[PDB]
Each structure stands twice: as C-alpha cells, then as structure tokens.
Amino acid sequence: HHIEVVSKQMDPLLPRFVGKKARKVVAPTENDEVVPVLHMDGGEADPNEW
Amino acid sequence: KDYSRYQRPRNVSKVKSIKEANEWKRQVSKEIKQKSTRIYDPSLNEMQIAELNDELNNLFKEWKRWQWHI
Amino acid sequence: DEINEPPPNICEQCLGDEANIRMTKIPQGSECKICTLPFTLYHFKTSKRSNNIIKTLICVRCATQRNICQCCMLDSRWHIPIQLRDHLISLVNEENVMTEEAKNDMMKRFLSLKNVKLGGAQITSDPSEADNIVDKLKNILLRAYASVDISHILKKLPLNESFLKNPSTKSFFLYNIDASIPEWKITDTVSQLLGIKKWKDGNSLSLIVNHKAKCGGLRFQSSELGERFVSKISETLVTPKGLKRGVLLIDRFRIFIIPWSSGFSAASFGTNTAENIKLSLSLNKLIQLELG
Amino acid sequence: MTSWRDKSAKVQVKESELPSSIPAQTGLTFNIWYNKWSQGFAGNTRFVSPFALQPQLHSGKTRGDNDGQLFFCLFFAKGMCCLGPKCEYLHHIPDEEDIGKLALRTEVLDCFGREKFADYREDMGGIGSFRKKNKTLYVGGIDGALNSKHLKPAQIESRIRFVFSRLGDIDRIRYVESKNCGFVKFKYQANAEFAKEAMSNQTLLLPSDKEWDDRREGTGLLVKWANEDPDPAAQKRLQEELKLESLNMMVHLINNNTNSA
Amino acid sequence: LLIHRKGLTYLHLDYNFNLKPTKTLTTKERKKSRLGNSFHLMRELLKMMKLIVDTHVQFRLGNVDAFQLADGIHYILNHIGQLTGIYRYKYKVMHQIRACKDLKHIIYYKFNKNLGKGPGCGFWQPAWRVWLNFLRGTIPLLERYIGNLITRQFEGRSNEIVKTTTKQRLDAYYDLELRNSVMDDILEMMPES
Amino acid sequence: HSDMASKMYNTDKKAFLGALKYLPHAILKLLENMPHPWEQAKEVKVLYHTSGAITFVNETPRVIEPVYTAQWSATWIAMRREKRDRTHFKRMRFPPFDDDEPPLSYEQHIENIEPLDPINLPLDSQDDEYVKDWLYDSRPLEEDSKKVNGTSYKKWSFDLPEMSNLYRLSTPLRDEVTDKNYYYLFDKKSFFN
RNA sequence: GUUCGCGAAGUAACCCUUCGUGGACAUUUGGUCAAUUUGAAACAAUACAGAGAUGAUCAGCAGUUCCCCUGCAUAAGGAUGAACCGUUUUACAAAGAGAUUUA
C-alpha cells in the first residue's frame, strides 16, 4: 500500500498537541552488555593512620 | 438527606414515616461502626472499652425496641 | 528521539483493498490506550466515500512489543487476537506464554520504554520461528442436597406422559440439557427444523432453560405449530414401561421432550439455586431409568 | 425483515420532549466547564430513565442503512433518539449479518462505535475492555428497579428473561436469589454491548403492576460487566470452549501456511 | 469559563467585569482562588473596553445626546485610574494615566477659553491615542502571559523546576557546594573501604 | 453559545479558553475603529471564529490627514458652541449599566431604532461649498475615482479650492506658526543638549 | 442552467417558438468529536487530630522525593508547602580452652 501522509489544518484556538501533558516518567535501563571495571591489581599495606 | 440537627433520636414516636426511618436507622449504624472500630485498640484501656461496652448495650436495647415495634 | 520515529504498524485488512490511501498524521495526537503516553496519531479512511475513520489507538512502541497493528490490535502475522495467540503457543511449547500488563500508571509507562518483546512477540515477527510452530500445530491436529423437599415441584413437571401426535399443546418440557449447549443453540435447532427462521421477529417460540436444573421448557404460539414440531421429529425413545419421548438432537447431545399441556412459566424448574441442583440430581435417575 | 426491513425507523422522543442538558440540582452553583453542580454535599445522582426501547415497535430503516453504517444508534437503545429515520446510525437489534460486518471492528470498539479501554473501570461499568471478549452482563440493582416489590425470587428472574430476550440471542440466564442479582450471557458481544446500554437505569415494572405510575421515583437497575464465574462447573466450561476456539483457529491457520508455503 | 474550569465557582464574574466572592472563603480556597496579574490585567482591559462600548449603546438607545457621547468617551479615557483599577496589576500604566491627565490640561484650557467651568468637552482624540499605544505594547505581554496560563491549565506545570540562585538562598547553596568539595577531597585521600 | 451546557460544546469551550491570549489584539482592533463624533453608526469588517469565540475587527482606520484635521476642528467649534449655549449639561453616570444585567442584545434592542443626529457643524454654503457634500462621511470621497485611487483608500489628491477650504476649517487645530525661528532653543536638538 | 453546433415541427420566408441530439462550462464536503446516569475536575460540610529545630517562646533558608499547588515566571508564596522522624545482622577471619561424637 502506497500511503500519502498529510497534516491536518490545526485550529489556532484549540490546543495543539492534545496528548501533550506535563507528566513524569521513570525510565528503564537497557543493560545488554556488562562493562568490565578494568582496575589494576592491588602498596596496599596500611596502618591505622586513616 | 441532612438530619444532622435532628437527634439520634432517643424518642421514636415523633416520626410516623418508615422510609424517613430508613435514613434515621443508618444514622445509628454509622456510629455503631465508628465506636465498634473504637472498641479494639493497642492500649485496650478498660475505661474506653467500658464506656463503649455501655454504648453497645444501649444500641442493642434500641434494636430490641425497633424489632418490638415491628 | 522526536525527529527520528518509526513508521506505523497497521494491518493490511485495516487498510483494506484500495491502492492509495490519504492518511493524516498528527505529531502528538491522542495518548496510547496501553501506556497512556502520547504518540503520532495516524488516522485514515479505506475509500474516499467511506463513513468510518480508522484511528491508531496505541503507540508504535506498544505495537512493537506485542507485535500487533495500531488500529485493530490483532497480530501482524496470523491476524488473531493476543489472548488466543498466547494460548496457541502455550499448547506447542507446553509452557504458559503470556504478555502481562500493569494496572499502574507509573508501571504502564515503565513497561513500554523497554525494548523487549512481550508474550508471543518473540515467536511472531520471526518468520522462521513462526512457521515451524504452525507445523507443530499440525501434529496436534493429527490427535484431533438430600435434605430438600422437592416433592412440590415434580408434581408440576410432566415426567409421566408420552410424546404422541394426538395431544395438541403449546408447551413442551426439555430435560437432559447439559451445562454447555447455550439457549440460542436450542432455539436455532428447533427453528431449523420448522423453517420458521428469524423467529425473534414474529415471536413464534419462547424458550426457558435453567442450566442448573439441566431442564427447560419451550412455549409455542399458535398450537398448530405444535403438530409441526411433533411431526418433524422422527427419532424417539420408549421407556421399558412405555411412554415414548421424543429426542431433540443438538450435536452429540440428546434432549428429551414431553408435551406439558399447560404453560410451565419461570420458577417451575426451581425457586432457589440450591433447590435447582437437586432437580438435575432427581432427573439423572429417570434418564438412566428411561434408557436402561 | 418483516419486523425490521418492512418499515422505517420512527422518532422515539420529540426534540422538545428531550431531557434538559443540565442535571438535577445537587449543589449551590452550576459549573459551566464541567456541566455539574459544585457547592453541594452529595447525591445518589442515579435516576430511572424516562424512556425505554420497544424493540419491535421502534426498529426500522434509517439513513445509515442506506449509507452502509456499521454502528448502532446509542440513543435508540436508550429509547431517546430524536432523529428517527434521518439518523446516521442503525436502529435495530444486532443480527448475525450485522455483527459479521463488525467482525474486523469489534476487537477495539463496541457496537456503538465507542472505543474500548485497556483495563476495566473499577465498578465494572462503562464501555468495556479489549483484552477480554466479555459477553456476560451483571444485572444488579433489581431492588430499585422493582420499586421494592417483593415479587418472589422466580418472578424477578422471569422478568429478566422477558426483557433481555428481545435484545438478542441469549446463551444462558442465571439469577441468584441470595445476592439479588442476575447474570445474562449472550451469543455475541455486540448484543451484550447493546443490551447493557439499553437496560441501564431501567425498570421491570410491567404496567399491569400497581406501581406503574411510580416507576420514575425509583432508583433504577444497574447493568454492568460481569466478572469471571467462580465455580469449577463453569470454569471447566471456559477451558473447553477455549479449546474448541483454538482448534477452529488452527484449521484456519494451517491453511494460511498452506497458501504461504 | 476559566474561573469555572479552575473550580472557582464561589467567585462571581459580574457583567461589568467585577470579580467578587460569593461567600466567606476558607484559607485553602483563598490560596486556590488567588488569580494573578494576567487574569486581572485582562479583566481590567475588558472593563475598560465595555465601559466605552456601553456609551455608544446609550447613545444608540436615544438616552444620550451625541455631545454627551463625545463627553462620555472623553470622561472614560481621562479617568481610567478611577473607573477601572488597571494600575493594581500593571503599574507602568501610570505613565498613560498621567499622560491623559496632562493632555486634559492642554485640552481644557484651550476649549474653555471664554467659557465657564462645566462638563461638556469631548475632544477625546489625544487621550484615545494614549490607550491605543498602551494596547500596542501589552499585546506581546499578555499573549506571553495568558498563553502561559492556559497551557498550564491544559497540561499542568513542569516537574523540572530548577530554582536559580538568589539573595534568599545564596548562603544555602554556598554550603552545598562547600560540603561537596570537602567530601570529594577526603574521599580521594582515602586508601579504601 | 449563550448556554453551553450540552456535551457538544466541550470542544468549543476549549476554543473560548484558547482565544484569551488573542483577546488583547481584539480590543486594539475594536478601539481603533471606534466611531468618531460625526458618525451615527459604522459598519466594520470583521473576522470571527466559527465557534463564536473571538471577533476581530479586520480593518485599519486610515484617513486623509487634512480632511481628518478639519473634521475634528469642526467638532471643536461645534462643541464650544454647545457648551456656550446649553443651560445645563448632564454628564452621564458611569458605569452606564448595572453589573447584574447582561449586555443587552443588538437586534432586539439596538438595531430597530433610528440612531440620533451626530456632532456636525452646519457648514455655511457660500463659504464651504467644496467640502460640505463629503466632509462627514465615514470614508470621505471613497468612491470618487479622481480624488482617491479607489475603495482601498490610499494616495489621495485634491484641487486648490478643496485644499484651502479644509485649511480654513482647521484653524482651531492647525499649527499657526510659519517661521522656524520660533523654535530656536525649543527644537529637539536643544532638548537633547 | 448557460453557451456553441445539428436535426425536425409550426410561424416564417432563413429570423423566432418548440423538443430531439452532440460538444463546452462546473467535479468528491465533514468527523481524532453522537445528545443527561456507566470512563472519571474539584471544593464545601461532618467526625477525629491539631504547626520544625524547645526548657519555653519566636525568624527563616535549603536539600532528597516515581507529591505538587498558586503564580507571567528561572521571582515569590504554599506550616521553614508537604512527605523526611521508622525498620536496622553474614565480603567475616585468625589464635587459645571444657562437654558431646566418629570410626
């Protein structure tokens, strides 16, 4: 099906974007791959000075 | 329909109508629910249950009176 | 992304038969039925002269996660509802697949923004993973109250009279009706038998069936139809005392009839649910006494 | 045909006889945006519908029959349609020919054209859900509809059987004397959707009755959507008909793969 | 319509655009019904507009002579500070109110040369031009203001309100930045755990 | 759209509410096209929303500046003659209507009546013969093809007797100074200094 | 309906009337929306309590939050706007002694 997409002539007095509200959304995290936390090994001896 | 100004009311004879009495009767059951909830408490004080216990005897006697009229 | 958005998912049978369709795009139109979050409302008409606007009810993210079109919300392949789709895959994988939906507005919005597929939307939208399960559907086709005082009621049920031509009655007593076999199926079988089809216009027959008592009755207007109902029924069962009973014949079921010779009304079968169960329990013996 | 296609639809209510658009006053001032009353205590705000559908009387050809309308007139079901034969929507009981036209359309919206919702309303009233193909109605509020007549238990059910039978093919009717409510199941969802709006806020008074002059004073009967049937005698019926629906679809679906190959 | 959408049915908007409560309000209702400048500055513009339109109505009904119409319009434009109350919500209008007063001194002592003190002067053309130029500059103001009000009705207010720093809270924001810098520098000196 | 109580008006109520930002522009277009005192009535060209929300006066009032000066100058003379010989001038009461009564409809009340005479100086025939036929029109010489370009009403052009006649009527409101040496230290260059 | 032709009848004498017939002119509105209860504003009232740092009485300003409300607002106010005041166990080892087992 070849489908022509047109825009409707909006009423200048009715609110454009009728589904647009000020609402709040929490977003999920897309964690597909684990990022390796590539630290080095370990000068780790420490007295009670800290 | 309002009736807040009108007593419970302890007198029964004054209102002939039963359909109006249908509303007066809930006016009593509601208190039965409030105080009834007010019967069990963490403190379980004798003085509070004791007054509530008297209110329960007074209400049950009223239920006997409504049953007797019928 | 508000400047890079997918094209809408619509069925072929929503678009219909015509070639070119003028569709109207509103960039933040209505909000989605599922996730309650705004989207680009597309709406269109099948022909130019039609009289029904076909709107997209859900957003493309809710349409992708379920693999459904936005307009009729049927599956993009197989064109079936979602509840029937997830049931057919359940008989193949032998485990329950199900798309579950949140009742919570913060958890309707949360569940849409994730890029997963839900339910049978992993099986569908993969053509290789859908055709082989249709092949696995094909092997499945290769398989292809003793305390009650009921005695006031059973005097009024006939239970002792015969299904002959000679009585001329309006009403009949149908017993041995299963808890299946819906009230419309018994009126359609009688009206198919008489050719008095579209009976609800003229009100030729009126039928009451309890479905707890497993019993019922059907009333006719114009008693001359009663001899047409008697004569168009050929098969009968004779109880070994006598007293022949006709059989209505719903597919695989058998429903016995006796002329009531009065109007039974409602409440003849029972006036309480606990009371009606014992009348089915009363009858079950008489059916076994009629047959064996 | 003889009952419906022979005649044309008639005007149920004159446009001067139509009810006032402002509701009955339950407050101090009227609110113009939300067409309601504001500074008020409360109200039952449910009343008996003054109008009712006589199905064999009011049905007829409409403007939408010639135009090829799919959707039924809402105010025909309420018995309130002032347009009559000039009305854009259909004026008859749903039939197998009518619902077969709606078969692509019924999945998302009712027989009146109104869009259905994701989940049901809290009190099981309203239009309906598209996730469940519900064909069973909760007939409630019978005490208000009867006007409080005792009426026995079998008689109340018999009234439900007489009125709802005019509104389409019925699968079963169950009345529960203890719960004082009935459950009416139709053959099609479009007859349940029509009979829900038809019998909302109606009475069962049957004018030979003494009350018939005080049918308006009562509360009215609630027809809302029904829940699932809890007994396993009918639960096992549900998985059996779902099994038969599945086998009827797999035969239709292997032929689609036969054409696809 | 706007008052009644906000649930403020206990406020009556008169036909002369006077806004008065219909009862003694609770403090919660006084918080809710406290309209801002853009409502009242819009409402006072309609009070000014109707007051001028009503004199042409009174002229057209026959109740008012054409000289009284010219004097009536001249009275309105020179007494907007006492007939409307527009200064309460946009106090820059006191330039325009004092311009129409200063124009009236120029017009009267040229009109009333060899005439007595009396009402009938209706050379309202200079004071008309003042308010037409006042309306020239408040079109962009009230389109921004009432446009923010109506979109806050239809959509609600945004949840991303970031407060700028101010004299009011500069001692509060200083310590938040001071505590974070100390908490960073110690956590980096720490060996572990 | 008086009693918007039906469910059909739910869309039109949003149109009334979203037009409130455009209302100050509708007050500027209405007040600039206000009738001058020498006019009984004035037909204005309007633009209106189809739901009856807003009504803009879709014209701009353009005049011939020598003609317009002479029209206000003749009413200047006509109103000083009025205040001279009137025994008592009754200024009207403001506001001209009570705030409980609604604005009464144009057609039931205003349109059926004869208007009244406006402020017109009698225009002596031997001294004012070139202007007396067209001076107090709504748009003077609008359909005269030689004095104006047309009914778009731009770019006028007059002859010498008509131009001197407007000069003579305008002597209450003209400049009356012909030398620029009057404005020696009273020009705007000295005002800037 | 108009206009350009064509044909026939009558009046005419090639013009008019009449009705047959080709062209030309003009060519797809509207709805995301149906008219009181069942697809959703909200206050008020009744009852029960009753204003943070406290020993008592008085100013506040922030922060965290999947709470917002007034307001033109990135100003300010909403009790310092409210909620915050609870519940709290394993990254766990190394040494040194008496009872009960095991085979």
Ligand SMILES: O=P(O)(O)O[C@H]1[C@H](OP(=O)(O)O)[C@@H](OP(=O)(O)O)[C@H](OP(=O)(O)O)[C@@H](OP(=O)(O)O)[C@H]1OP(=O)(O)O
């Ligand atoms: O009381 P006065 O000092 O003599 O002044 C009055 C007064 O104007 P001012 O007080 O500002 O000068 C009048 O205005 P109101 O304050 O009473 O409204 C004004 O006439 P209006 O009332 O119509 O404005 C009147 O002018 P006139 O009497 O010439 O028409 C004018 O008197 P002056 O002529 O002495 O200025």
Ligand SMILES: [Mg+2]
């Ligand atoms: Mg404080």
Ligand SMILES: [Mg+2]
């Ligand atoms: Mg404070």
Ligand SMILES: [Mg+2]
């Ligand atoms: Mg705070």
Ligand SMILES: [Mg+2]
């Ligand atoms: Mg604050």
Ligand SMILES: [Zn+2]
């Ligand atoms: Zn969605």
Ligand SMILES: [Zn+2]
């Ligand atoms: Zn579809």
Ligand SMILES: [Zn+2]
């Ligand atoms: Zn209709």
